[PDB]
Amino acid sequence: MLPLLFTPVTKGSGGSGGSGGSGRDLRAELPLTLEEAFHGGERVVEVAGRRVSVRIPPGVREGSVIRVPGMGGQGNPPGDLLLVVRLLPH
């Protein structure tokens, strides 16, 4: 379940007087090599079949989560993005 970038979370926990589900939080584990983490360029990730490039920070490490507000939940309400950098053995 859930590819890279993309993570189909729901939001209906609560109640006021309508749909309380603005902004889907897509948390995907980002497999990132040591050279990739060192240089901090872009990494091409496949979100629901869409080829996009996400910019990774230079000197990023294992367990570092890249929070990008608005780029996550696609569609009508822009949601939060969480890419938890998982360093590949090199």
| Residue 66 to residue 47: CA distance in whole angstroms | 16
Please write down the HEC assignment for all residues of the chain.
CCCCCCCCCCCCCCCCCCCCCCCCCEEEEEEECHHHHHHCCEEEEEECCEEEEEECCCCCCCCCEEEEECCCCCCCCCCEEEEEEEECCC
Amino acid at 39: H
- CA atoms of 35 and 26, how far apart (whole Å): 25
- Domain extent for 78: 1-90
AA letter at 19: S
**What is the count of structural domains for the chain?**
1
Rg over alpha carbons for the chain, rounded to the nearest Å, is 14
Structure determination technique employed: NMR
47 CB-near residues (< 8 Å, 6+ apart):
3, 4, 5, 6, 26, 74
